[PDB]
Amino acid sequence: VIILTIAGNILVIMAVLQNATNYFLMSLAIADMLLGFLVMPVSMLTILYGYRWPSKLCAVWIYLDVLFSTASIMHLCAISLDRYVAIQNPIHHSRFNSRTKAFLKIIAVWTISVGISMPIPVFGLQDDSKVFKEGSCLLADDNFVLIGSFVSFFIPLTIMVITYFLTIKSLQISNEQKACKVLGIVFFLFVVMWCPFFITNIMAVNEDVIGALLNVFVWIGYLSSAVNPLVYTLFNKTYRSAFSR
Ligand SMILES: CCN(CC)C(=O)[C@@H]1C=C2c3cccc4[nH]cc(c34)C[C@H]2N(C)C1
């Protein structure tokens, strides 16, 4: 999954197709390539050593994990919200797009990503038990998980549910039907690969059963960083040719 993530994103970074909307997909592919080289391979060492953490970098590793995970989720939310306005009223969307929105959009999805994960090393790096190890380097803040995973997933999820319901409502002519199938695959994969981890994360707060469930579901969430390059790009004839060359 690590090799797949890195090899999938470094093939999308070169291919950039210099559109104002395609550059935003490079900012999404940069939030996942970093996730695939800094955060993800560290967890492979933890899997090898059986949850024992080789010590002051544990709070740093969680900071990057929350940062790149929230940066990815709101990249897809911004894409989904932008894709709805481009489909509802395309005339008024083209007038107000001067290649400054795309730079203003990268600012917004990285200000909230870095603003939500800022409590981790500013209050939690001094305390070695709040955002810190139970012997295993977990995120033991029981009140930040409830509200920090609420605005990071469930608010981007209720935004995506209304955006997806409204977009399909406004898309209903084969090209419109081909697009409706692309939205379904994109929406279904984001839910099925991130939602399983977040219900288990918050329902938890038998330990052995839940400890095994959260272990596998974490890697299902990581695996979505290998797929995001493909489902958001490879539907384009140009990208398929670019990957082959
Ligand atoms: C096994 C230990 N690890 C790995 C460092 C975690 O618990 C990570 C903690 C996360 C987490 C907590 C709280 C809020 C959040 N938003 C987004 C994420 C998040 C990402 C999420 N990653 C995928 C797992």
Curated annotation (Swiss-Prot):
GO cellular-component term (any): dendritic shaft
Q: Which residues lie on this side of the membrane: Extracellular?
A: 50-56, 126-142
Domain of life assignment? Eukaryota
Q: Which UniProt keywords apply?
A: Behavior, Cell membrane, Cell projection, Cytoplasmic vesicle, Disulfide bond, G-protein coupled receptor, Glycoprotein, Host cell receptor for virus entry, Host-virus interaction, Membrane, Phosphoprotein, Receptor, Synapse, Transducer, Transmembrane, Transmembrane helix
What GO MF annotations does this protein's record show? 1-(4-iodo-2,5-dimethoxyphenyl)propan-2-amine binding; G protein-coupled serotonin receptor activity; Gq/11-coupled serotonin receptor activity; identical protein binding; neurotransmitter receptor activity; protein tyrosine kinase activator activity; protein-containing complex binding; serotonin binding
Regulation acting on activity, per entry:
G-protein coupled receptor activity is regulated by lipids: oleamide increases HTR2A-mediated activity. Inhibited by IHCH-7179 small molecule: IHCH-7179 acts both as an agonist activator for HTR1A and as an antagonist inhibitor for HTR2A.
Residues crossing the lipid bilayer are 1-14, 24-49, 57-81, 102-125, 143-168, 181-205, 209-234
Q: What is the membrane topology here?
A: Multi-pass membrane protein
UniProt domain comment: The PDZ domain-binding motif is involved in the interaction with PATJ, CASK, APBA1, DLG1 and DLG4.
Q: What's the protein name?
A: 5-hydroxytryptamine receptor 2A
Which part of the complete protein is shown? 84 to 393 of 471
